[PDB]
Amino acid sequence: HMKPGFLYTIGLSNKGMPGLYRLELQVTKGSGKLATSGLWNSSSAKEQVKIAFDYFKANASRISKVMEHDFHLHVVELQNTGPLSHLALPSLVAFASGLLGRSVQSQMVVLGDMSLGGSVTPVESIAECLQVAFDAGAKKVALPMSSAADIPTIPVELFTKFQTSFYADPVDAVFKGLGVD
């Protein structure tokens, strides 16, 4: 499929516009250092990626040691929408994919986000995000469980275009994005 540590995500930009982004995480031999690029000089994006990396360090046993590798997360803005406001959960998925050397499911977009407390949050404007996902050729989507309540907000022609999986927590999100749960 795709290179491990690479994944597509779709989310509302800082200006409220749905956009498609590609996370490109590189893993090397190191000490556990997180470097970032493409974060638009945004302290908010950096803090989100940091929350993701902290959760990664704290729960990497449930998925191997991050302290023996160095990570560089580049973020590619594919549709000129600005900074992505929902980066924690996609970054966690990209971190775990990079570590385990497992590729994210082919033609899948990961949607949703993660709070500091470690709970997943429903996709913001899921109808618009999935419209972007369909227009971008995505075939599968991984969604937070709560977003099921928003299924009736999505036009049925659009929602039934996807093969959809649901995750209950960040680790479950990792397993759904890699294709093993």
Residue numbers in the entry: 496 to 558, 562 to 679
What wording appears in the published article?
To better understand how BrxL’s C-terminal domain relates to those or other protein domains (and to provide a starting model of that domain for subsequent CryoEM studies of the full-length protein) we expressed, purified, and crystallized BrxLC. During the final step of purification by size exclusion chromatography (SEC), we observed that BrxLC eluted at a retention volume consistent with a monomer rather than as a higher order multimers (eventually shown to correspond to hexamers) previously observed in studies of LonPC and RadAC. We obtained crystals and solved the X-ray structure to 2.25 Å resolution. The crystal structure contains 4 subunits in the asymmetric unit, with no obvious higher order symmetry. The backbone atoms of BrxLC superpose well with both domains despite low amino acid sequence identity (BrxLC shares 14% identity with both domains); superposition of BrxLC with RadC generates an RMSD value for 148 structurally equivalent α-carbons of 2.3 Å (P-value 8.97 × 10−14); superposition with LonPC generates an RMSD value for 172 structurally equivalent α-carbons of 3.3 Å (P-value 3.02 × 10−12). A structure-based sequence alignment of the BrxLC with RadAC or LonPC does not demonstrate obvious conservation with previously visualized DNA binding residues with RadAC or with a protease catalytic motif as observed in LonPC. BrxLC’s distinct solution and assembly behaviors, in conjunction with the low sequence conservation relative to LonPC and RadAC, indicate that the BrxLC domain may have adopted a distinct structural role in the function of BrxL as compared to the same domain in LonP or RadA. In contrast, purified BrxLC is monomeric in solution and (in the context of full-length BrxL) appears to mediate dimerization of heptameric (without ATP) or hexameric (with ATP) complexes through protein-protein interactions with another BrxLC partner. In the DNA-bound dodecameric complex, BrxLc domains are far removed from dsDNA occupying the central pore and do not share significant conservation with LonP residues essential for protease activity or with RadA residues involved in DNA binding. These observations imply that BrxL’s CTD has evolved a distinct functional role from the LonPC and RadAC domains.
